[PDB]
Design a binder for this molecule. Structure first.
Ligand SMILES: *[C@@H]1O[C@H](CO)[C@@H](O)[C@H](O)[C@H]1NC(C)=O
Ligand SMILES: CCCCCCCCC
Lengths: 425, 409, 406, 395, 388
C-alpha cells in the first residue's frame, strides 16, 4: 500500500507541525471557505428561546505542506487523514446555550494532491435566538447561527463563503444548503428564507478575533393549526356563549352562573397561553391581547347581568318607579329595539275589606311586572350593544394576526433574494 | 524504602493489560461475582427504572501477578489501580441509559497467590418492567443482570461467590449498613446463574448472573392520602336521594360535583403509573367504576326531577302507574250570584290541579327511595370487593414457585 | 512557516508549563482580569442560579516566552495552544454546578515582549441569592467572583483589565454592541467590577463583577394581576345582587375559588425561599381574604333576608341601626245558611289581615337585609380600592439605587 | 499467556491504524453491516425522534493482522481494543439529536485469517417522519440510514448482513408492536462522475401502536361528557338546573383540555383523529347550551308581551306531538261589595286566560325539548361512529 | 523560574505515583481530613437527597517529595498537579446520585518538608433519611460518611482536622438553618481479625427548616377553607344554596390535599401531621355535608306524609330554644254560592293547618342549624388554643 509511504513522508519525514498555520511566510492569510448544510430542523422550544439544529459544516482551505506529485507515488489522487494529525481551523458557534462550541463528530479530512483540504463534520447546535411573540400564534421567527474564528485574528485567517461553479463562472453560496430529497420539513415550522452573510465590524481592529463573522439566518413561519384547533376556536365559541346570558330570562335563576362560567373557562385558556410562551416583556402576544379584551368584556357582561337582576327584583315596598324610568324603558327603547242586623253589616264590611286587599295586591303585582319589563329592556339593549362589539373585536384581532406574512425579502435594505435558484450574476 | 514500590515495578513491568491471563490454550478464567446492596434509592414507575446503590465484588486469578512473600519482606497484598490491570468486562446489561461500566474505578487488591479482589461501588439504574395491575397494593420483581461484555463461555466462566464452601445465592445485606426504604420492603433476594440456550458458548450472551429483588410496597401512606379521601368523596353521591326534587334542591349540582371530584382523583392517579398499555391499575379500575356509578346517579336524578315536576298540562297520570307506584312499592243579585259561583268553580279547579301535582311528587319520592337502596348497595359492594381483592395480593411464599429453597443466609 | 517552527522549538525546549513564571524567587505575577458579557441567558429563580455567556480577558507576563523578532523574520507574536503555556487557574468561585473552569480553550496570544493574553469563552452558571420581597417588581444584584483557585496574594496580584487602547483600567463588564443579545425580561442598570479582600485572611483576593438587573414585569402584570383585578371587581359586585336572585353564593364562591387557583398556579414561578413574602403573593392573599369575608357577609345578608316572625323577633338595636340611622346616610331610603256564609266571609277577612301583618314584618326584615348589603358594598369598594392602590404604589416605587455601591 | 502477549506485540509493531486495510490502494474494503435492535426506548411525535437501543455488528478483513497459529501455541482468536486498529466510520445519516457515530469503543474479535468482528452497542436517536392522522390508531414507518461518512464506494463498500434486522433478543415495548422490519442498500451517483458510487443501508421498522392507554384516558371521558350533554334535554325547565348541568359539562370538558393537550401530539402537519373527535364534542356541548338557552327562554314567555304565532301552534301543538310515539306526553256599602265581587270575578277570568297562554308556551317548550333529546342522541352516536369506525374498519 | 523548573524536574524523575508514601511498608500514612461546607445546594425531600457544595481539605506527608531550599534559591513551597503525586482515594460511602470520589483534580501545595495540602471541591449528593412527621416545621439530621476505600487503618489512617466541619464561609440558605454540626471518627472491626481496623469519618448537620414559605402558600388557604366549612350552617335553607357552598369547600380541600401529597415523600415510616390533619378536616367537611343534607331534608318535610314525633317536638321546640341566650330565635243557585263560599273557607282552614305544620318543621331545622353552628364555633375556639 503506497498510502502508508505517502503519509509517512507527509507527516513524519517532513516533520509536520499541526500547531502552525499552513503559510509559507508568516504574514500571509489562510482563506477558510465555510458553508452550512441543514440536515433537519429539530425544535425551536420557545420557553427557553433555543434553536436545536442538525447541520453539516463544510470547511475548505489550502495546506501547501500536504502536497505531493501523484506520479512519484502510485496514482493516488486523494487521502483521508484524521483531524488530530493535521492543522484544522477551529470555527465555533459563538451564540450557543449549552456550551457546545464545536462540531459533534470529528471525521477525516479529504486532501487532494494539490493541497486542497475539505472537511465536512456534522454537528448538533443549540443556539440562542430570541422569540418575538407579538403575533403569536401567527408569528414568524428570525433565528441566527453566528460562527467565529477565535483561535486566530483576521490578519491570520480570513473566513469566506464557499463558492460554486455552473458554467465556468464562480459565485458565492449565500444560503443554507438544503438537499430537497433528504430534507424532511419540520412539524411546526416552515422555512421561508435562509441567507448567509460574511460580516465585517469596521469599528474593531483586524488584529483581533472579534473582527470577522459568518452568520447563517433561518427565517421560519409557524404553521398555526394546532393552536387554531385547540386554543382559538374553543375560546371563541365559549366567549360567544357570554352573549347568550342576556337572552336568558331573569326568572331562571341562572344568568350569573352562565356568565361566571364563561369567565372561568377564559381563565383556563389564559393559563394555557401563559404556559406556552417565554417570560419576555417586549410586547403582549396577540392571543394575550384577545384574551385580555374578551375577559374584560365578559366581566362587563357579568356586571351588567347583575344590574339587570337588581332591577328585576325591585318592588314597590323598597323602590320608587319614577316617571323618567318608565318613559325611557317602557316607551322609547322598546320601540327603538323592535321589542315585542249587625251580622249583615259585618259581612258587608268583611267583603269590602277583602276587595280592598285584593286590589292592593293587584297593584303591587302590576308594578312588579313593570319592573320586570324594565329589566328585559335593559337586557335587550345590552345584548345589542355588546354582541357586535365582541364579534367585531374578535374578527379584527384575528384577521390582523392572519395578515402577518414574512417580509418576502430578508435584509430589507437589500434587493437580493438570497435564493439558491438565482445566484448573483 | 517502601518495598511495595519495587515489587509493583517488577509485577507491572513486562505486563500487557490487553491479554486475558490464560495459562494454557484451554484454560478458562473463573470470575466470581457477589452483590452487596447498601441503599435501594428509588423505583421510578414513569421511566420504569430501579435505582440502587451497590458494591459489586468481583474475584479472579491472574497468574502473572504472583510473587514470593519471603522475597519482599513478607508483603502479601498490594493495591494496584484498576486502569493498569486486565479486568473481566463485567457489565450490567439491563441498564436504562448507556452506562454499562462501574462508577468509581477503585484499586484492585492483589494477593501473592495471584488472587485479584475488586470491590467497586456503583449507582445502577436498571430496567424493571412494572405490573400495575394491583396498584398500590402491588409487589415488584426487579432484576439486575450482569454479564461479560467481551468474553464468552469459552474464555471466562461467571459464577457466584462462595464463603466456607457454601454458595452465596442471594444479595448480601448487612443489617448495620443497610437502611430501609420506607416505601418498599425487600421480601426475597435470590441470585442465580442463567443460560440463554437459544445461543451457543461463543456468543458472549450465553451466560449471565441475575440478582433478583422482590419488593413489596408499604401502602399506609397511599391509603391515608388517596383512597380514604377518594372513597369518602365518592360516597356522597348517594346523598342526592334525600334532597327535594324541585328548584333549590340542587340534586344535579351535588351529583356533577362529586363526578368532577372523582375526575380530579383520576388525574392524580394518572401521573403515578407507567404509560404502558397492558393493564389498568386497580385504583384506576375503582375510579372508573365510581365515575360510571355517579354518571348513572346523575341520570337517575335527572329522571326523578323530570317525573316530580310533571303537571296535568303535559303528562297524564295513568291509573296503572298511580296504582303501581302508590299501592305496591310503598238585576244586580243575578250578577253577584254568578260571580260567586264562578269564583268557587275556579278555586276548586285550581285545587284539583294542585292535587294532581302532589301525586306526581309522591311518585317521584317513591322512585327516589328505591333507587337510593339500589345505589347504596351497588357502591358499597363495589368498593368493598375492589379493595378486598387489592388487600389479598400477597407476595409469593418462595422466590421461585417451582423451587423449595428459601435462598437466605 | 519554517521560521515559526524554529521559534517554537527554541521557546519550548525546557519550558515547563507547570511552573509559575517568576524571574526571582519571591516575585509575583500580575494578572489582569476582565469580563465581556455576550448574553445573559437565564436567571432561574427556583434554583437561584444565573446563566451567562462570557469571555474572560486575562493578561499576564511570562519572562520565558521572550524572543527578538529581528532574528526570526520579524515575527511579532504567536498564537500558541493554551495547554502549552502556564496560565493562572482563574475560576469562577461562586458557581452553582461544579464547573469552575472555562469551557472553550482558545489558544493564547504571546508577544515578543513576553505578554501573554488569553480570551477564553464560557457558559457559566453562577449562584446569586434572590431578594423576594418585590417580585415580580424586583431588581436583583447578582455577582460573579473570579480568582485563582490555587495561587494566593503571595504568588499572583490580580488587577483590572485595560481598555482597547490600553491606557486606563476598565472597571466594568464590557458589552460589545455587535455581539450582545438583550434578555427581554431583564435590563442591566449597572455593571461594575471591583477587587475584594478579607480582613481575617491576608492571602485572599478576588475580582468580582456585579450585575444589577431590573425585571420587566409585563408578563406577570397581564397573566396574574389583570384577572385578579377582575375577580376583585366581581367580589365587590356580589353585594349589589338582590338576595332573591339566588346567585350570591355562586358568584362569591366562584371568585374565591378563582383567586385561590391563581395563587396555586404561581408556586411554579415564585421563588421558594422563606426570608420574605413576595408582593404578588401578598396581593393574592389580600384578595383571597377579602373574597372570603365577602362570602361570609353574603351568607349573613341572606340569613337576614330569609327571616320571618314565625322564626325570629327583631330586637330593638337592629331596628335602630338599620331601619332608622343607616338608611339616610346611604341614600337608600324607602237563617243558619246566611250565618254560615257570614262566618266564612269573616274568617277569610281575618286570615287576610293576619297575612298582611305577617308580610309587613317579613318586609321589615328584608329591608334590614337590603341596608346591610348596601353598607357592605360601600365598605368593600373602599377597602379593595385603597388596598390595591397602596400595594401597587408600594411596588411601583422600587428601583435600583443610582450608586451601585461597588 | 506469553504466546498471546508475543502475538499481540508482533501484530501491532508496524501497524498504522490510519490506513485502510487493503493490499493495493485501488482495491476496496468489503464490510458486512448488520443491525440488532435490542429495545425500542421511545418515540417522540412532536419532535419526530425515535430512540432505540441497538448493536451495530460489523465484519471485515484486515490483511495486516494475519498470523500462523502453529507459531503461537495454537492461538486462533483474540480480543483487541477497537481503538488499536482501523475501524470503519459508520455514521447515522438521519441522526436527530444523539451521537453520529459509535462512541462505546468496546473490544473486537480477531481471527487468525484477519477476519474482524465488532459488535458495539449504540443508542440511536433517529429522525422519524411521524404521521398523526390516525392517532392513536396510527402506524409509523421510519428508518435508520447508515453509511460510511468519509469514504466512497470505490474505497469502502458496505453490504447488509441479512435481508432484514435481527430481533432475536428484542424486548417487548409495551406501547408499540413490531409489525414489520426490513433493510435495503442504495447506490447514489452525482452529475460529477459516474465511476464513484456512494452507498448506504436503510433499515426501516413498521410499528403499530397499542391504543389502550389513550382510549381509557381520553376517549372514554369524551363519551361520558357527550352522553351527559344530551342528558340535559330530559331535565324539565322548572327545576333551575338546565344551565347548571350543561355549563358544568362544558367547564369539565374545558378542564379536560389540559390533560388532552399535554398528552396528544402538538404537531401542525395534520389534525389528529382524536383532535377531530374533541372538536366535535366541544361544538356538540356548545350547541346544546345554545339550544337549551333558547328553550328556557321559550318556556318563560309571557302572554302579556309575546303572542304565539299561528305556525308555532300548528307545528308544535298539533302536528309533532301526534307522531312522537316514544313519549307519553298528553295530546250604601252593598253596591261597593257587589262591584268588588264583580271585579274579583273578572280579574280571575283574566288570570285564567293569561295562565292558559303561558301554559301553551310551556307545552311548546317541552315538545322542543323532546325533539332535541332524540336528535342529539342520534347526532352523538352518528358522529362518534363516523369519526372512529372509518379508520377502525381498515384495521 | 529556572530554580523551580529544576526542582520539579528532580522531584518527579524517579517518582512512582502508584506506591504509598511511606518509608517502610509497615508504617501508615497519617492523613488529616477536614470538610468545609460552602453552600447547601438543595434538599430533595421526595427523592431524599441532599446536594451540598464542599471543599475536602486533606493533609499528609510524602518524604519522597522533600528538598533542601538552600540548593534551589530558597524556594520553600510549590504547586503541583494532583495527578502527578499519590493521592488518597477518599470516597463518600452514602453517595446517592453523584460521584463517589473527587473528580476535580486541582493543584496541591507542597512544602520543602514533604507536607502536602490538597483542598479539592466537590458536589456531594448524599442520601438523607427525611423524617416528614412535623413538616413543614421539621428538622433534618442527615450526614456524609467519608472513608478511605482500599486501605485499612494499618496502612492509611484518617483523622478529622477538628471536632466540627468548617462553616466559616457558609452561604446562608434561605430555606434551612444550621442548628448544629459535628464530625465523628468510627473504628470498625470484623470477625475475621481484630488487628485490622477500618476507619471512617461521619459528618452530620442538623438543619431546621424555615416554615414561612410553606405556611403562607399552603396552610393559610387550607385554614381559610376549613373555617368556611362551618359557615354553611348559618345559610338558610330557603336560599337554595347550601350544597353549592359545602361542595365548593370540599373541592378546594381535596385540591390542597393533592398539593400536600405531591409535596412530601411517599415513605410510610411515619404519618405526616399535615396529612393527618388534612384527612381529619376532610372527614369534618364530609360530616358537614351529610348533616346539612339531613337539615335540608327536614326543612322540606311535607306535613301530609310525615307527622312530628313527640320527642322531636319537645327537644327542639320546648327546651333547646330557651338554652340559646345570645341568639334571636322566637320562643236556586244562591245555595250553590253559599256552598262555594263555605268551601273556600274550609280550604283556607286546611291550608293554614298544613302551613303551621310546615313552619314547625322549618323551626326544627333552624334550631338544628343553630346547634351545629355553636358546635362549630366551639371546635374553632378549641383549635385556636392548640396552636398556642
Ligand atoms: C521463596 O523465597 C524463599 C527465600 O527467598 C526460598 O527459600 C523459596 O524457595 C522461594 N520459593 C517458594 C515457593 O517459597
Ligand atoms: C266572596 C269573596 C271571596 C273572595 C275569595 C278570595 C280568595 C283569595 C285567595
Amino acid at each position: 500500500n503506497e498510502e502508508e509511504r505517502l503519509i509517512n513522508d507527509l507527516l513524519i519525514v517532513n516533520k509536520y507541525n499541526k500547531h502552525v498555520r499552513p503559510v509559507k511566510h508568516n504574514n500571509e492569510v489562510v482563506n477558510i471557505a465555510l458553508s452550512l448544510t441543514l440536515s433537519n430542523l429539530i425544535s425551536l422550544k420557545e420557553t427557553d428561546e433555543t434553536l436545536t439544529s442538525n447541520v453539516w459544516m463544510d470547511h475548505a482551505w489550502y495546506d501547501h505542506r500536504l502536497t505531493w506529485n501523484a506520479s512519484e507515488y502510485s496514482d493516488i489522487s486523494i487521502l483521508r487523514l484524521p483531524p488530530e494529525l493535521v492543522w484544522i481551523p477551529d470555527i465555533v458557534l459563538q451564540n450557543n446555550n449549552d456550551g457546545q462550541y464545536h462540531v459533534a463528530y470529528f471525521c477525516n479530512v479529504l486532501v487532494r494532491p494539490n493541497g486542497y483540504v475539505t472537511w465536512l463534520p456534522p454537528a448538533i447546535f443549540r443556539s440562542s435566538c430570541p422569540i418575538n411573540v407579538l403575533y403569536f400564534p401567527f408569528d414568524w421567527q428570525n433565528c441566527s447561527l453566528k460562527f467565529t474564528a477565535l483561535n486566530y485574528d483576521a490578519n491570520e485567517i480570513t473566513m469566506d463563503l464557499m463558492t460554486d461553479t455552473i458554467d465556468g463562472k464562480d459565485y458565492p453560496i449565500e444560503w443554507i444548503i438544503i438537499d430537497p430529497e433528504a430534507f424532511t420539513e419540520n412539524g411546526e415550522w416552515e422555512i421561508i428564507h435562509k441567507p448567509a452573510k460574511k460580516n465585517i465590524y469596521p469599528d474593531k481592529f483586524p488584529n483581533g478575533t472579534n473582527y470577522q463573522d459568518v452568520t447563517f439566518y433561518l427565517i421560519i413561519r409557524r404553521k398555526p393549526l394546532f393552536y387554531v384547533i385547540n386554543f382559538i376556536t374553543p375560546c371563541v365559541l365559549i366567549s360567544f356563549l357570554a352573549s347568550l346570558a342576556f337572552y336568558l330570562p331573569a326568572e331562571s335563576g341562572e344568568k350569573m352562573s352562565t356568565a361566571i362560567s364563561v369567565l372561568l373557562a377564559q381563565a383556563v385558556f389564559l393559563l394555557l397561553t401563559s404556559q406556552r410562551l417565554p417570560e419576555t416583556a417586549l410586547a403582549v402576544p396577540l392571543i394575550g391581547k384577545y384574551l385580555m379584551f374578551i375577559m374584560s368584556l365578559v366581566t362587563g357582561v357579568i356586571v351588567n347581568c347583575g344590574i339587570v337582576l337588581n332591577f328585576h327584583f325591585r318592588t314597590p315596598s323598597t323602590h320608587v318607579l319614577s316617571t323618567r324610568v318608565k318613559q325611557i324603558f317602557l316607551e322609547k327603547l322598546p320601540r327603538i329595539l323592535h321589542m315585542s242586623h249587625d251580622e249583615i253589616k259585618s259581612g258587608i264590611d268583611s267583603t269590602n275589606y277583602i276587595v280592598k286587599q285584593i286590589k292592593e295586591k293587584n297593584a303591587y303585582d302590576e308594578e312588579v311586572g313593570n319592573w320586570n319589563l324594565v329589566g328585559q329592556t335593559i337586557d335587550r339593549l345590552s345584548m345589542f350593544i355588546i354582541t357586535p362589539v365582541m364579534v367585531l373585536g374578535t374578527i379584527f384581532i384575528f384577521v390582523m394576526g392572519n395578515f402577518n406574512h414574512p417580509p418576502a425579502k430578508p435584509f430589507e435594505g437589500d434587493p437580493f433574494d438570497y435564493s439558491s435558484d438565482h445566484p448573483r450574476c | 524504602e517502601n518495598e511495595e514500590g519495587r515489587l509493583i515495578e517488577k509485577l507491572l513491568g513486562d505486563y500487557d493489560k490487553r491479554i486475558i491471563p490464560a495459562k494454557t490454550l484451554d484454560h478458562i478464567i473463573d470470575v466470581t461475582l457477589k452483590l452487596t446492596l447498601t441503599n435501594l434509592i428509588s423505583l421510578n414507575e414513569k421511566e420504569e427504572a430501579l435505582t440502587t446503590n451497590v458494591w459489586i465484588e468481583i474475584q479472579w486469578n491472574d497468574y502473572r501477578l504472583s510473587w514470593n512473600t519471603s522475597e519482599y519482606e513478607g508483603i502479601d497484598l498490594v493495591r494496584i489501580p484498576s486502569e493498569l490491570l486486565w479486568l473481566p468486562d463485567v457489565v450490567l446489561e439491563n441498564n436504562v441509559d448507556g452506562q454499562f461500566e462501574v462508577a468509581y474505578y477503585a484499586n484492585v487488591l492483589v494477593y501473592n497467590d495471584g488472587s485479584m479482589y475488586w470491590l467497586p461501588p456503583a449507582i445502577y439504574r436498571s430496567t424493571c418492567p412494572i405490573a400495575v395491575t394491583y396498584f398500590p397494593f402491588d409487589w415488584q420483581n426487579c432484576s439486575l443482570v450482569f454479564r461479560s461484555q467481551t468474553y464468552n463461555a469459552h474464555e471466562v466462566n461467571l459464577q457466584l461467590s462462595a464463603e466456607e464452601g457454601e454458595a452465596v445465592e442471594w444479595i448480601h445485606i448487612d443489617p448495620e449498613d443497610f437502611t430501609e426504604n420506607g416505601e418498599w420492603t425487600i421480601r426475597h433476594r435470590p441470585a442465580k446463574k442463567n443460560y440463554n440456550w437459544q445461543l451457543t458458548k461463543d456468543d458472549t450472551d450465553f451466560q449471565e448472573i441475575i440478582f433478583f429483588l422482590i419488593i413489596q410496597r408499604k401502602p399506609l401512606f397511599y391509603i391515608i392520602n388517596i383512597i380514604a379521601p377518594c372513597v369518602l368523596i365518592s360516597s356522597l353521591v348517594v346523598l342526592v336521594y334525600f334532597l327535594p326534587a324541585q328548584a333549590g334542591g340542587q340534586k344535579c349540582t351535588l351529583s356533577i360535583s362529586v363526578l368532577l371530584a372523582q375526575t380530579i382523583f383520576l388525574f392524580l392517579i394518572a401521573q403515578k403509573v407507567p404509560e404502558t398499555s397492558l393493564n389498568v391499575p386497580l385504583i384506576g379500575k375503582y375510579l372508573i367504576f365510581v365515575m360510571f356509578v355517579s354518571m348513572l346517579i346523575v341520570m337517575n336524578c335527572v329522571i326523578v326531577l323530570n317525573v316530580s315536576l310533571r303537571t296535568p298540562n303535559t303528562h297524564s297520570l295513568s291509573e296503572k302507574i298511580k296504582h303501581l307506584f302508590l299501592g305496591f312499592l310503598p238585576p244586580e243579585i243575578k250578577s253577584c250570584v254568578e260571580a260567586c259561583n264562578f269564583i268557587a268553580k275556579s278555586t276548586k279547579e285550581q285545587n284539583d290541579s294542585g292535587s294532581e301535582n302532589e301525586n306526581w311528587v309522591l311518585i317521584g319520592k317513591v322512585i327516589d327511595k328505591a333507587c337510593f337502596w339500589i345505589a347504596l348497595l351497588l357502591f358499597s359492594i363495589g368498593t368493598l370487593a375492589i379493595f378486598l381483592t387489592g388487600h389479598f395480593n400477597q407476595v409469593p411464599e418462595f422466590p421461585f414457585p417451582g423451587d423449595p429453597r428459601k435462598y437466605v443466609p | 512557516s519554517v521560521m515559526e517552527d524554529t521559534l517554537l522549538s527554541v521557546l519550548f525546549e525546557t519550558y515547563n508549563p507547570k511552573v509559575r513564571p517568576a524571574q526571582t524567587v519571591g516575585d509575583k505575577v500580575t494578572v489582569r482580569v476582565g469580563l465581556t458579557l455576550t448574553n445573559l441567558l437565564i436567571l432561574n429563580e427556583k434554583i437561584e442560579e444565573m446563566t451567562t455567556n462570557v469571555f474572560l480577558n486575562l493578561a499576564w507576563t511570562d519572562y520565558r516566552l521572550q524572543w527578538d523578532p529581528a532574528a526570526y523574520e520579524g515575527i511579532k507574536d504567536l498564537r500558541i495552544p493554551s495547554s502549552d503555556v502556564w496560565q493562572p487557574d482563574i475560576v469562577l468561585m461562586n458557581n452553582n454546578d461544579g464547573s469552575f473552569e472555562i469551557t472553550l480553550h482558545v489558544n493564547v496570544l504571546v508577544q515578543h515582549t513576553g505578554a501573554v493574553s488569553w480570551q477564553p469563552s464560557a457558559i457559566y452558571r453562577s449562584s446569586c441569592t434572590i431578594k423576594v420581597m418585590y417580585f415580580p417588581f424586583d431588581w436583583q444584584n447578582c455577582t460573579m467572583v473570579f480568582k485563582s483557585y490555587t495561587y494566593d496574594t503571595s504568588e499572583v496580584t490580580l488587577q483590572h483589565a485595560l481598555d482597547a487602547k490600553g491606557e486606563r483600567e476598565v472597571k466594568e463588564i464590557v458589552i460589545n454592541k455587535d455581539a450582545f443579545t438583550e434578555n427581554g425580561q431583564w435590563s442591566i442598570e449597572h455593571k461594575p467590577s471591583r477587587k475584594n479582600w478579607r480582613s481575617d485572611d491576608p492571602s485572599y483576593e478576588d475580582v468580582t463583577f456585579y450585575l444589577i438587573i431590573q425585571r420587566k414585569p409585563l408578563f406577570y402584570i397581564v397573566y396574574t394581576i389583570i384577572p385578579c383585578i377582575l375577580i376583585s371587581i366581581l367580589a365587590i359586585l356580589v353585594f349589589y345582587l338582590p338576595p332573591d336572585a339566588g346567585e350570591k353564593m355562586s358568584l362569591s364562591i366562584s371568585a374565591l375559588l378563582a383567586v385561590t387557583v391563581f395563587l396555586l398556579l404561581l408556586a411554579d414561578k415564585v421563588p421558594e425561599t422563606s426570608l420574605s413574602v413576595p408582593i404578588i403573593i401578598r396581593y393574592l392573599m389580600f384578595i383571597m381574604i377579602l373574597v372570603a369575608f365577602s362570602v361570609i357577609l353574603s351568607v349573613v345578608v341572606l340569613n337576614l333576608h330569609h327571616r320571618s316572625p314565625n322564626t325570629h323577633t327583631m330586637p330593638n338595636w337592629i331596628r335602630q341601626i338599620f331601619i332608622e340611622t343607616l338608611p339616610p346616610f346611604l341614600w337608600i331610603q324607602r237563617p243558619q245558611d246566611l250565618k254560615e256564609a257570614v262566618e266564612a266571609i269573616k274568617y277569610i277577612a281575618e286570615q287576610l289581615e293576619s297575612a298582611s301583618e305577617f308580610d309587613d314584618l317579613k318586609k321589615d326584615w328584608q329591608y334590614v337585609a337590603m341596608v346591610a348589603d348596601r353598607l357592605f358594598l360601600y365598605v368593600f369598594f373602599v377597602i379593595c380600592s385603597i388596598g390595591t392602590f397602596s400595594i401597587f404604589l408600594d411596588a411601583s416605587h422600587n428601583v435600583p439605587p443610582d450608586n451601585p455601591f461597588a | 499467556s506469553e504466546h498471546e502477549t508475543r502475538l499481540v506485540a508482533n501484530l501491532l509493531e508496524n501497524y498504522n491504524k490510519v490506513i485502510r486495510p487493503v493490499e493495493h490502494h485501488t482495491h476496496f474494503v468489503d464490510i458486512t453491516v448488520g443491525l440488532q435492535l435490542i429495545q425500542l426506548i421511545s418515540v417522540d411525535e412532536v419532535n419526530q425522534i425515535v430512540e432505540t437501543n441497538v448493536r451495530l455488528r460489523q465484519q471485515w478483513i484486515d490483511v495486516r493482522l494475519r498470523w500462523n497459529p502453529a507459531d503461537y501455541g495454537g492461538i486462533k482468536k483474540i480480543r483487541l481494543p477497537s481503538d488499536d486498529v482501523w475501524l470503519p466510520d459508520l455514521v447515522l445519516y438521519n441522526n436527530a439529536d444523539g451521537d453520529f457515530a459509535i462512541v462505546h469503543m468496546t473490544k473486537l474479535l480477531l481471527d487468525y485469517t484477519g477476519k474482524i468482528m465488532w459488535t458495539p452497542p449504540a443508542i440511536f436517536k433517529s429522525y422519524c417522519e411521524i404521521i398523526v392522522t390516525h392517532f392513536p390508531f396510527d402506524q409509523q414507518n421510519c428508518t435508520m440510514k447508515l453509511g460510511i461518512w468519509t469514504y466512497d464506494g470505490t474505497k469502502v463498500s458496505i453490504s447488509p448482513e441479512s435481508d432484514r434486522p435481527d430481533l432475536s433478543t428484542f424486548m417487548e415495548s409495551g406501547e408499540w408492536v413490531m409489525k414489520d422490519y426490513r433493510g435495503w442498500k442504495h447506490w447514489v451517483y452525482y452529475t460529477c462522475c459516474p465511476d464513484t458510487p456512494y452507498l448506504d443501508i436503510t433499515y426501516h421498522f413498521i410499528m403499530q401502536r397499542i391504543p389502550l392507554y389513550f382510549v381509557v384516558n381520553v376517549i372514554i371521558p369524551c363519551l361520558l361528557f357527550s352522553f351527559l350533554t344530551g342528558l340535559v334535554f330530559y331535565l324539565p325547565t322548572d327545576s333551575g338546573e338546565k344551565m347548571t348541568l350543561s355549563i358544568s359539562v362544558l367547564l369539565s370538558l374545558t378542564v379536560f383540555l389540559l390533560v388532552i393537550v399535554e398528552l396528544i401530539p402538538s404537531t401542525s402537519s395534520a389534525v389528529p383523529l382524536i383532535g377531530k373527535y374533541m372538536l366535535f364534542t366541544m361544538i356538540f356541548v356548545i350547541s346544546s347550551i345554545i339550544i337549551t338557552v333558547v328553550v328556557i327562554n321559550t318556556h318563560h314567555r309571557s302572554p302579556s308581551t309575546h303572542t304565539m304565532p299561528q305556525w308555532v301552534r300548528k307545528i308544535f301543538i298539533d302536528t309533532i306531538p301526534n307522531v312522537m310515539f316514544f313519549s307519553t306526553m298528553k295530546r250604601p256599602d252593598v253596591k261597593s261589595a257587589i262591584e268588588g265581587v264583580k271585579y274579583i270575578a273578572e280579574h280571575m277570568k283574566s288570570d285564567e286566560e293569561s295562565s292558559n297562554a303561558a301554559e301553551e308556551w310551556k307545552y311548546v317548550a317541552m315538545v322542543i325539548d323532546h325533539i332535541l333529546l332524540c336528535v342529539f342522541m342520534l347526532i352523538c352516536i352518528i358522529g362518534t361512529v363516523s369519526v372512529f369506525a372509518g379508520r377502525l374498519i381498515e384495521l
